[PDB]
Write a protein that binds this DNA or RNA. Structure first.
Ligand SMILES: [Zn+2]
Ligand SMILES: [Zn+2]
Ligand SMILES: [Zn+2]
Ligand SMILES: [Zn+2]
Lengths: 258, 296, 278, 278, 258, 296
DNA sequence: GAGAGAAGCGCCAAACACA
DNA sequence: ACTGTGTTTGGCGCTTCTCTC
DNA sequence: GAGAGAAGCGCCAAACACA
DNA sequence: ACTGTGTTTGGCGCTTCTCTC
């Protein structure tokens, strides 16, 4: 439900339009809530930018490490209790686990990002590291969302809040220019190249002998064609009326009938 | 009527035909937001069930099916564009149009689709009407048009140079006559995907294309919105032959705004990649004039 | 006579024909004896397969695992998608409902929101805090049969793969930190490695064009029941129990009254067909 | 580059071709890495088969088994012939060398005199009394590898069969005495039941015309050695050990130096092929 | 060696002739040792005769139960510390485990052999039991052999001695009339019947695909013929030069080539 | 010479031939216990290796092999019998003879042996000479002869009635002319094995056989040694037809020694089984005379 | 000059362990 | 609903290539 | 009267447990 | 030398027989 969805994440209105909520229902819910009232890269994972941030807590402090993709804006953030080159390396690796491997990384000078530890981390992955001294918008977005989440519930362990904020700004908020989420824009496949003076052919899938789950039979019944494939299954039309997902233990490759 | 699957196979295709003709009836959402809700829901359900049925069974497409679906697409999609108003405006008829787009994409990419039956049903008029749609004010429609035109240009072999010349004409018209166009990024992405697939040595038509319609596209005011696609196209183009880079350099060293402006960052970023790729294999022909004009 | 010879010695089939009997009659004599079927550990039942999603982020399986590193016993919480196979994993210090909630939210931030999650009947997955957390996100939570560790085959196999990769890493750098190793393992598994049979990475499947819709399903089950020798899944024994009659039976299990007061669900691996006494 | 990518992440094969590499080169890169072969529990070695006689009363296998009956723990001593499969078995109160000698003499009186007997390395089969008894009859006594319970597969399978028959008997008459049950089981097994694949009873094979003579044999073994990852048969572990070089190797095992001071015999089930470092 | 063989079992001379010993060596060994110096049935296991015997020990007594086959003389004996119908049943079953199932059993009247327990044991096995009141030779043979074995070693547990005596008189002593041991005469197969006006054919054995042990191959190499068969093996001529025993796990049945 | 297996296959059979001719040389053990020990050991080793080789390889027997092995058997076995002396006497030439017997048995029972090639190499003279051997004073030789004649009579179809008539003549000669014969138990066992294989209804020749040569065999003095085989033959015979038992009863009720003698137990034991089998299906025709003569 | 050895490449059944 | 699975590894066929008579 | 259902019979791969 | 195996069990093809149009 859009009401609960906003009461939990404080997402935007164009996001709620995607769900059961409609334009005027979204406009009603948005301001009925109290607390609510260029690109340099060329491809996804081409250039990143890495900042740091002090997030003020009433009895302590948090050090946020934030990386942003300069083609979609995909945010990856981690919270630490101190800041060294070890934790910069930890943040970069935790980001690589989420988004992928960047080709070029750019960050500000400092005690970290400038030692030999960080350069040795960046040289084992073939990531070139350029340093410059004087994006800051997404940092503020993430900070305001943290503020809201803490405002509604004060007993949050700071680990749930960061994950919920990352979920909101990566999978829920819709960008205004292209009507795409950051995740959707960041992971949508590119267009395949086109061989010249060569017809671009359709791919032909393989043929399988199959058996029906839950039957205990011992006879492979006819070679068919696989429509769709996934991990640990395959969509096989057992008849010309219905199609079933057959696991890999009940499938055997064959050769075209000719 | 009926569900398309719950009938005996003999007449099954026949019912499909009727379903298509049950979707060619128009319903206008902009005329008033509440009108013929039952018929609109029927159309939506029919489109959803047909797109579901077309991607689970093989050998459903037959000869008397192509022109009917082509006509259905031409009736639902080919239309006059809404009045212009420069967050962007969104088409109010988007549900049914999205369903039609997904249907056409799933149909064109079926493994049973034969690439020799639309040479008498999809001709230059189809390409013209589908290419005049890239001026839509809605980005989702532009994305669908891009991913459809890519499949069309890939599958067909007699419409390639025709589409290239038409795109050249579109580029000329936009750069010179009228400056009101919003699909210059999806077209550029398609162009880059096409450019990456060349062979050696490069044909001269491609050199004319690069020198006449890609480089001058820099001198427009609204280059900032679609700079990434253009830069990607240029860097992807000049890899096939490393000698044909000098004209690009001496053309980029002119359209540079010789005054102070916020538009400099685009030129610096593009020059960064062009210089990164050009450095190998003795490139010092224009390095001195490049750095001279850069110091300014 | 065959029947009294078997009633005395419990000989086989090829012995009862050599004393006067048709082959089918000896087969019936053997298939009817209850002392010879109560004690033979050999049976023949169909094989069951776990439930899998029809599209990404439909069904998830979750688990916890121990890892002994530098005199510390880390708890790895693992959540794996069933359609594509994408994995998410975080290391905690101990097991509690708060740790489960935080790990689930990590997983949601990394992969997306799932419709259904099914885990075992642990002491931290059935708690009221976890139930309230799941209901706060509109996520259905079912469980498995207690003491059947093969109903979570995918997530257990994934625990094995993850620990194997971690051991390969720690073989080279015995001073490598834990979070770095877990992050490198997750990157390797999700992005670099290729699945064996479909030949695509887990990421390519997770972010494939969702355009193919869900095939329709059918909740129709089999309308007849039979008699079954059974074993209680928790404790293993020499001889079968029963026979009894099934109340109902779905694909992969059956409802057998273990006692007279209460029934129980038994998989198709601790059941053996019996003969109808009437 | 493939080699540094694998040296960092330990990715698979289908990943190294997608970064620039021939298939054979990626195969070599994987087959050379020692951290990926030390940790993968999957191996591929030939299967071994026990030694069998060339004619009846040539080789015997012996064993003991527990049986819980009426609060008493009987010790069944079992001796089985390898050519025909004929069994002999006696029930005793406890295990000692005197019991072993008496059981062996029972077996000899029932079946005949064997040339060779091979049993495990128990505390009552290696004693001086048993050795003197065996030498008094001109019977060779060899042993197996310690902690390899599958080298006496025939006699263990026979223990299973014998206990299954005993349980079938005690299901009917829970007051039946022990010697009567053992005698009925022995009669059933030796005289009434038919072997599965040859379709003759054990007795018909044991007392067949010995006219077919012994085929000649050959003690020629393989003349080359290789390198092996190994596991010590007693204790199981996660990762392999080694590699090392074999001193010699006969069909079914190999001689591997477990330590620097002493060597050991390891079967073809705890060995994994390694690459030659030179 | 014949010397040790006699020093252990005190077997006969015609027995030692079968081994390495020759006629005059057997005659020398026989009297160089100190302590040494009709048929009613029609087929093996047709009629038995069962006796009982007190064997006198210097501090106790043994009750020997002895059954003898009245066509070969095969002895089966058991020693007990008392005598009841339970122990008569135990003796009969222990004999059945050794020799086979008799068709007709004959024994003397007494407290046992005449109760309902023994008749109920004999009626569940289809063995008819005839009782008569007044062979005794084999009993004396077995008793004298027990005496000899005790004479040589006094510390025998009476369980080894009985087994050694049974081994000697069943598998070692050669009968004088037919030059056969009791075991050999008792277990040699009878002649198969002969169909009239029908050629008695040779049995044709089956054909197998096989693999070589210790090679790890995955290809069945040619259908051959099995010469001999046993439990858990089969004699297969891999070539026309040598033949090997292939286990059953490496054999697969086939059909004649035609 | 050489081992038979270590030669190339082409000439392999040839060597086998020579080996057979290396076994036809005679060595006499009764002439003196120590003579030509080396040659005797060579003969024994050759026989052992040949019998080992003949039972492990298929398609070794060929056409030019049958008469040679027949001649070898006829040379080693067919001979005059030793002088009679009434523990029994044992042949001193037993090793080589046992080897020859085992060789012949393994050869005749090979699966490659063809039952149509010895119809021109094994004729009535072979049967006569092999059947005159049942008077041997050694029991092992008699056992081997029995188990060989069984295989011969089973495999061949033209020598059956001939062997039966010859056995009838042997029985007549033993019962009447000469009483010195020691093979009347193995012959009776073979006869019983033959008798069990009849069909219905019984031929009249078999009735003549039973009434003329089986029943009178009772009146001999030395019936006690071979009583079991005779009784088994009678009881096995009369099962095929239950009506043809009365002549057996009225013939056994005459040859009974009407005086006191130790020979009564045989007649009582046989009458026990005959009465056990005859009782079903209304048998009281001769019960009164049987019991009358039995009371005596 | 040509037909045979040699290397590359895909595919598959049997094991194995996480619980 | 309740329900085992994914990866490794030598062998083997099948296609392409190169060194010798 | 004839061709199809029905019962008999052999054969085989996958499990299982003794340690 | 050193070394896993034998039995059970439903399904399935293949041969023989019987009840109906
Ligand atoms: Zn809000
Ligand atoms: Zn039973
Ligand atoms: Zn590695
Ligand atoms: Zn002595």
């Amino acid at each position: 439900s859009p009401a609960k969805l906003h009461s939990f994440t404080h997402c935007g209105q164009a996001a709620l339009t995607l769900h059961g909520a409609t334009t005027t229902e979204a406009l009603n819910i948005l301001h009925s809530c109290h607390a609510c009232r260029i690109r340099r890269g060329l491809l996804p994972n081409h250039i990143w930018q890495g900042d740091i941030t002090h997030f003020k807590y009433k009895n302590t402090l948090y050090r946020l490490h934030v990386w942003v993709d300069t083609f979609s804006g995909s945010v990856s953030a981690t919270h630490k209790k101190r800041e060294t080159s070890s934790e910069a390396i930890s943040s970069l690796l935790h980001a690589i686990a989420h988004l992928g491997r960047p080709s070029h990384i750019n960050t500000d000078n400092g005690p970290a990002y400038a030692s030999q530890e960080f350069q040795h981390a960046c040289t084992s992955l073939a990531i070139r590291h350029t340093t410059h001294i004087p994006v800051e918008r997404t940092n503020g977005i993430l900070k305001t969302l943290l503020y809201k989440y803490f405002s509604d519930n004060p007993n949050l362990p700071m680990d749930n809040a960061l994950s919920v904020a990352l979920w909101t700004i990566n999978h829920l908020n819709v960008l205004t220019h292209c009507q795409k989420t950051r995740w959707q824009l960041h992971h949508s496949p590119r267009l395949p190249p086109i061989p010249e003076a060569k017809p671009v052919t359709t791919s032909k899938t393989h043929w399988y002998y199959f058996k029906i789950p839950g039957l205990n039979s011992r006879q492979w019944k006819g070679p068919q064609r696989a429509l769709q494939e996934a991990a640990g299954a395959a969509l096989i039309p057992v008849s010309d009326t219905a199609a079933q997902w057959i696991p890999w233990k009940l499938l055997k490759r064959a050769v075209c009938p000719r | 009527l009926l569900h398309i699957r719950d009938v005996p196979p003999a007449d099954q295709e026949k019912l499909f035909i009727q379903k298509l003709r049950q979707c060619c009836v128009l319903f206008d959402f902009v005329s008033d937001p509440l009108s013929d809700l039952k018929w609109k829901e029927v159309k939506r359900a029919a489109l959803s069930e047909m797109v579901e049925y077309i991607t689970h069974n093989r050998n459903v497409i037959t000869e008397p099916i192509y022109p009917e679906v082509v006509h259905m697409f031409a009736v639902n999609m080919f239309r006059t564009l809404p009045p212009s108003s420069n967050e962007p405006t969104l088409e109010a008829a988007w549900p049914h149009l999205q369903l039609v787009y997904e249907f056409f994409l799933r149909f064109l990419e079926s493994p049973d689709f034969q690439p020799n039956i639309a040479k008498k049903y999809i001709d230059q008029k189809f390409v013209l009407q589908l290419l005049e749609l890239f001026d839509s004010e809605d980005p989702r429609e532009r994305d669908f048009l891009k991913t459809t035109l890519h499949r069309i240009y890939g599958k067909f072999l007699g419409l390639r140079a025709y589409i290239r010349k038409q795109i050249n004409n579109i580029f000329y018209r936009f750069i010179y006559e009228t400056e009101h166009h919003n699909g210059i990024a999806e077209l550029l992405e398609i162009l880059g995907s096409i450019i990456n697939g060349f062979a050696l040595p490069l044909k001269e038509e491609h050199k004319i294309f690069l020198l006449k319609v890609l480089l001058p596209l820099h001198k427009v005011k609204s280059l900032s919105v679609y700079h990434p696609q253009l830069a990607y196209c240029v860097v992807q183009f000049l890899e096939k032959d490393s000698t044909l880079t000098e004209p690009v350099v001496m053309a980029l060293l002119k359209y540079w705004p010789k005054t102070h402006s916020p538009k400099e960052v685009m030129f610096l970023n593009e020059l960064e990649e062009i210089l990164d790729v050009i450095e190998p294999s003795e490139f010092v022909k224009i390095m001195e004039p490049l750095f001279r004009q850069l110091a300014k």
